[PDB]
Each structure stands twice: as structure tokens, then as C-alpha cells.
Amino acid sequence: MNGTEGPNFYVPFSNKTGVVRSPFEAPQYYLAEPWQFSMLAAYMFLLIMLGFPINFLTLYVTVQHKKLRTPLNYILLNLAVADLFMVFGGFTTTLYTSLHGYFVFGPTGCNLEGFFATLGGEIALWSLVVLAIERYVVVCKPMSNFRFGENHAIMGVAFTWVMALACAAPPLVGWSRYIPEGMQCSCGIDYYTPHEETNNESFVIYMFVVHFIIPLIVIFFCYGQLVFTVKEAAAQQQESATTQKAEKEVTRMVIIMVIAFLICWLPYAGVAFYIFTHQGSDFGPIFMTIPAFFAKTSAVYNPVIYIMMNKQFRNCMVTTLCCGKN
Amino acid sequence: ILENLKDCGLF
Numbered sequence: 001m002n003g004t005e006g007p008n009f010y011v012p013f014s015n016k017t018g019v020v021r022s023p024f025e026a027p028q029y030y031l032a033e034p035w036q037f038s039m040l041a042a043y044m045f046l047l048i049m050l051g052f053p054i055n056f057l058t059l060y061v062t063v064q065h066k067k068l069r070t071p072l073n074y075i076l077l078n079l080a081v082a083d084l085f086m087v088f089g090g091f092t093t094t095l096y097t098s099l100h101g102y103f104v105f106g107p108t109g110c111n112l113e114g115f116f117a118t119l120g121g122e123i124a125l126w127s128l129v130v131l132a133i134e135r136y137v138v139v140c141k142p143m144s145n146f147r148f149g150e151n152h153a154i155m156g157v158a159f160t161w162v163m164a165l166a167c168a169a170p171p172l173v174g175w176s177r178y179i180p181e182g183m184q185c186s187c188g189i190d191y192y193t194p195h196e197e198t199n200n201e202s203f204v205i206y207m208f209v210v211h212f213i214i215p216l217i218v219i220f221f222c223y224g225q226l227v228f229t230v231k232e233a234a235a236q237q238q239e240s241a242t243t244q245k246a247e248k249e250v251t252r253m254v255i256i257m258v259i260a261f262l263i264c265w266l267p268y269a270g271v272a273f274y275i276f277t278h279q280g281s282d283f284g285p286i287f288m289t290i291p292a293f294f295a296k297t298s299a300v301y302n303p304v305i306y307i308m309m310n311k312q313f314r315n316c317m318v319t320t321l322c323c324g325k326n
Numbered sequence: 327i328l329e330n331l332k333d334c335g336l337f
């Protein structure tokens with residue numbers, strides 16, 4: 001007996017002292033110091049300060065730089081938009097709830113928040129995949145005489161959106177569900193309560209297989225092929241210093257992107273998988289945030305990786321930020 | 327493929 005169940009929540013603290021209140025009614029200061037709530041607040045503040053600009057600036061720049069509006073860039077835009085759902089849907093909310101010490105918006109708030117929060121994350125995630133697929137297609141030319149254009153880019157994006165809804169929407173309608181997670185200030189997919197009227201158990205498998213293993217296998221194969229396609233092209237062009245560099249640089253970028261994709265979702269997956277194998281074993285309200293911490297903060301490093309290091313976007317940002325040019 | 331790499335933001 002480690003949790004306190006409630007009609008709409010799971011407080012990861014034991015009400016044997018009779019102090020646990022609904023995380024929708026009263027501050028959860030008994031499962032974590034008020035200060036740690038502020039630290040939470042602090043971090044949400046950080047993610048908003050950094051996250052908002054980087055992601056907003058991305059869109060903003062695209063509206064102002066013809067060259068950025070190529071269709072091979074849509075998925076990146078998509079990414080930023082997704083990060084923005086994460087900012088306004090997730091971060092700001094939490095910053096706000098965290099400062100009350102509980103989820104002041106109640107069940108439906110939980111649902112809204114959880115939905116937009118997870119929607120964005122999923123979109124972003126699936127973009128990273130879609131992006132991989134596209135580069136694979138474009139660079140490894142696996143298709144006879146195919147040429148990537150606006151329509152693909154569009155589908156590519158639409159797909160992202162679908163996949164996201166394919167995961168965030170079910171909870172809203174009874175396959176799993178959104179409950180206050182961690183310190184009860186943000187809302188998430190219930191992946192740790194065997195709560196059965198919703199079938200969390202299966203859903204989590206669906207999540208784990210479809211929204212983590214598929215992506216991982218696809219992203220791995222794609223960039224694998226790419227880093228092979230480029231490594232090979234260089235071995236066949238050892239005379240061309242650039243091709244050499246390009247190979248070197250693309251490899252480095254892939255290692256970054258992959259390691260980054262892992263840092264972002266491994267935690268969630270790893271934890272989910274553990275919890276799904278080690279039953280009744282309690283997990284603290286803070287430990288339940290570690291995974292969230294890595295995922296949410298991606299809304300900053302993804303744009304750093306996929307946008308700020310992308311040479312064009314960067315030059316554009318610099319130009320814009322410095323009024324004149326470089 | 328430098329061209330396609332520069333198209334993908336990769337190079």
C-alpha cells in the first residue's frame with residue numbers, strides 16, 4: 001500500500017497518515033516539500049523562457065525568409081509547433097499549477113492539459129521520425145526516380161498529426177486516461193496504474209510498441225542507411241574534401257540526433273517497461289518526474305539540434321536577431 | 327550528395 005487511489009487520480013504517497021488530498025482539491029505538500037514545488041516551478045519557467053523563443057523564433061524566421069519555406073523544412077516547422085503545444089499546453093500550465101502545489105484545474109483541466117501536452121510531444125516525436133524517413137528517401141534514394149515535393153512534406157506532416165492523435169486521443173475516450181502524474185502538478189498518460197476500466201495495461205503496450213519501438217526502429221534504420229549512404233559516397237570520392245567533411249559531419253549529426261532521441265524517450269519507455277514488470281512496487285512522486293523531465297526539456301534541445309544547428313535556419317535567426325545581417 | 331545533404335539541413 002504505497003499509493004492513494006481516487007476517482008480520478010493516483011497520489012504516489014500513502015494515505016495511512018490520512019494526509020493525502022485529491023491533487024485536484026488541495027496542495028500535495030505531503031509528497032514533496034513546497035520548495036521542491038518551486039524548483040519544479042523554476043524548471044517550468046526555464047523551459048518556457050528557452051522553449052518559447054527558440055520555437056517561436058523558428059516559425060517567425062520562416063515567415064520572413066523565403067529560402068526556409070522549402071517543403072523539406074515543413075516537418076521542422078511542424079516540430080516547433082509541437083514544441084509550442086508543449087510550452088503553452090504543458091509548461092505554462094504546470095508553472096501555474098506547481099505554484100499552487102496541486103492541479104488547480106481539476107479533471108477536465110487535467111484532460112485538456114494532458115491531451116495538448118501529450119499531443120505536442122507525440123507530434124514532435126513523430127516529426128523526428130518523419131524527418132528521418134524523408135532524409136532517408138531524399139539522400140539514400142531508395143526509390144526509383146522519386147522526387148520529394150510539397151505534397152509529400154504535407155502528407156509527412158499530416159501523418160505526424162495522425163500518429164499523435166492516435167495516442168493522445170484514446171485517453172480522452174477511455175483507453176488509458178489522463179491523471180495528474182509525478183508531484184500531481186502536470187497531467188500525463190496513466191501508464192503505471194493497472195486501472196482497468198480504461199485498460200492502461202494494453203494501451204501502454206500499444207504505446208511502447210507503436211510509439212517507441214516503431215519510431216526507434218524507423219529512425220535507426222533510416223539514419224543507419226543515411227550514414228551508410230554517406231560513408232560510402234565518401235569512400236568513392238576520397239578526392240573531394242567536402243564529401244569527406246560532409247560524411248564526417250553527417251555522422252556526427254546522426255549520433256547526436258539518435259542519442260538525443262534516446263535521451264528523450266528511453267526514460268519514459270524504460271520506466272514504463274519496469275513498472276509494467278515490477279508490480280505493486282511503489283515509485284515516488286519525484287522519480288515519476290525524472291522521465292517527464294527528460295521528455296519535456298526536449299522542447300528546447302530538439303529545436304537546438306534540428307533547427308539551430310541546421311545551417312539555414314541558424315543564419316536566418318542570426319540575421320533576424322541582429323536586425324541587419326551577420 | 328552534398329546537394330541533397332544541404333537540402334536536408336544535414337550539411
Ligand SMILES: *[C@@H]1O[C@H](CO)[C@@H](O[C@@H]2O[C@H](CO)[C@@H](O[C@@H]3O[C@H](CO)[C@@H](O)[C@H](O[C@H]4O[C@H](CO)[C@@H](O)[C@H](O)[C@@H]4O)[C@@H]3O)[C@H](O)[C@H]2NC(C)=O)[C@H](O)[C@H]1NC(C)=O
Binds near residue numbers: 004006015018019022
Ligand atoms: C486520505 O485520508 C483521509 C482520512 O481517511 C481522508 O479524509 C477524510 O474524508 C472524509 C470524507 O470522505 C472526511 O469526513 C467528513 O468528515 C466530517 C467530519 O468533520 C463529517 O461531518 C462529514 O460528514 C457526515 O455526516 C453527515 C450527517 O450530517 C452526512 O450527511 C455526510 O454525508 C457525512 O456522512 C464527512 O464524513 C474526513 O474529515 C477526512 N479526514 C481528514 C483527516 O481529512 C481523505 O479523503 C483521504 N484521501 C483520499 C484521496 O481519499
Ligand SMILES: *[C@@H]1O[C@H](CO)[C@@H](O[C@@H]2O[C@H](CO)[C@@H](O)[C@H](O)[C@H]2NC(C)=O)[C@H](O)[C@H]1NC(C)=O
Binds near residue numbers: 001002280281282283
Ligand atoms: C510498496 O513499495 C515497495 C517498494 O519499495 C514494495 O516493496 C518490495 O516488496 C516486494 C514484495 O512483493 C518485493 O518484490 C521487493 O523485494 C520489496 N523491496 C523492498 C526494497 O522492500 C511493496 O511491495 C509496495 N507495496 C506493498 C504493499 O508492499
Ligand SMILES: CCCCCCCCO[C@@H]1O[C@H](CO)[C@@H](O)[C@H](O)[C@H]1O
Binds near residue numbers: 033286
Ligand atoms: C528541511 C529543509 C530541507 C533543506 C535541505 C534540502 C535537501 C536536498 O535534498 C532533498 O532532500 C529531500 C528530503 O526532504 C529528498 O526527499 C529529496 O529527494 C532531495 O532532493
Ligand SMILES: CCCCCCCCO[C@@H]1O[C@H](CO)[C@@H](O)[C@H](O)[C@H]1O
Binds near residue numbers: 027095096099100101
Ligand atoms: C504565473 C504565476 C501565477 C500565480 C500563482 C498563484 C497561486 C496561488 O497559490 C495559492 O494561493 C492561496 C492564497 O489564496 C493559498 O492559500 C494556497 O495555499 C496557494 O497554494
Ligand SMILES: CCCCCCCCO[C@@H]1O[C@H](CO)[C@@H](O)[C@H](O)[C@H]1O
Binds near residue numbers: 223231
Ligand atoms: C543508427 C545510426 C548509426 C549511428 C552512427 C553510425 C556509426 C558512426 O561511427 C563511425 O563508424 C565508422 C566505421 O565505419 C568509423 O570509421 C568512424 O570513425 C565513426 O564516425
Ligand SMILES: *C(=O)CCCCCCCCCCCCCCC
Binds near residue numbers: 321322324
Ligand atoms: C539587433 O542587432 C539587436 C540585437 C542585439 C542585442 C543583443 C543583446 C543580447 C541580450 C541577451 C538576453 C539575455 C537575457 C536573458 C535573461 C532574461
Ligand SMILES: *C(=O)CCCCCCCCCCCCCCC
Binds near residue numbers: 318323
Ligand atoms: C545579434 O546581434 C545577436 C543577439 C542574439 C541574442 C541571443 C542570445 C540569447 C542568450 C542565451 C544564452 C545562451 C547560453 C548558451 C549555453 C552555452
